[PDB]
Amino acid sequence: GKIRASHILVADKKTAEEVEKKLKKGEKFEDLAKEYSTDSSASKGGDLGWFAKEGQMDETFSKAAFKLKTGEVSDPVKTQYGYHIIKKTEE
């Protein structure tokens, strides 16, 4: 099957550690994507549309996205592109 989620991607973990604090401070994940993400998804509030566990974004990212439940947010994930952060939005 498939799921839908939103993400934030950064060049190194030091930017992701600030986003983890910002998420507890009160700012929404969908607006932090417009302020901290470096992927083209930033202007969409981090959204990626529907995808599968097989590795459509990255083989490490997809496993973390599928562990979640709709509404839940994830701790940082290393890939070949940088450090990602994920939040599931539909299933």
From Swiss-Prot:
So which domain of life are we looking at? Bacteria
Family affiliation: Belongs to the PrsA family.
**Result of changing residue 57 to A:** No effect on secretion of proteins and on growth
Entry comment, domain topic:
All three domains (PPIase domain and the flanking N- and C-terminal domains) are essential for activity.
Q: Where does it reside? A: Cell membrane; Membrane raft
Name of the gene encoding the protein in the UniProt record: prsA
Entry function: Essential protein that plays a major role in protein secretion by helping the post-translocational extracellular folding of several secreted proteins. Has PPIase activity but it is not essential for its function in vivo.
Resulting phenotype, residue 39 to A: Decrease in PPIase activity. No effect on secretion of proteins and on growth
What is the organism field in this record? Bacillus subtilis (strain 168)
Upon changing residue 82 to A, the result is:
Decreased secretion of proteins; no effect on growth
What is this protein called in UniProt? Answer: Foldase protein PrsA
Effect the entry attributes to changing residue 84 to A: Decreased secretion of proteins; no effect on growth
Q: Where is the PpiC domain?
A: 1-90
